[PDB]
Design brief:
InterPro entries: Tscrpt_reg_Crl, Tscrpt_reg_Crl_sf. The chain is of the alpha+beta class. It has a single domain, classed as Sigma factor-binding protein Crl monomer (TATA-Binding Protein). Strands 1, 2, 3, 4 and 5 form a five-stranded mixed β-sheet that branches.
Length: 126
């Protein structure tokens, strides 16, 4: 599969992919799952969520998810509020997305492989 077709097919999954942040053989996804605080002003608004780097190595796509905060400056940081309701919300968006991603990957006849750093991922996949 061409990089252009990968991008198109990954775009079909939903608003996760961030084309602008995708490199030659790396694709970037994220998900704003839970507003930190809705009472705040637009300029200070932040989200708990996840982001994911996907490295292409031939027929392999190697995934590394991290969980954390998307801050008011547009940066992801790997710290998260220690609230069960928030962490569950993030987890459910990640599970749903990954299931779309695997289905997409089978349909492109490729393989989905966890990065070695997934050993330190704090929640499970499906």
């Amino acid at each position: 599969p061409t990089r252009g077709k990968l991008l198109k097919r990954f775009a079909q999954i939903g608003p996760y992919i961030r084309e602008q942040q995708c490199q030659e053989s790396q694709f970037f996804f994220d998900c704003l799952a839970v507003c930190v605080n809705k009472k705040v002003t637009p300029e200070k608004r932040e989200f708990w969520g996840w982001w994911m780097e996907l490295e292409r190595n031939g027929e392999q796509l190697i995934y590394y998810y991290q969980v954390g905060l998307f801050d008011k400056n547009g940066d992801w940081v790997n710290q998260v509020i220690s609230k069960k309701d928030v962490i569950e919300s993030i987890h459910e968006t990640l599970i749903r997305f990954h299931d779309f991603l695997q289905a997409a990957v089978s349909e492109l006849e490729m393989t989905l492989v966890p990065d070695e750093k997934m050993s330190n991922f704090p929640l499970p996949l499906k």
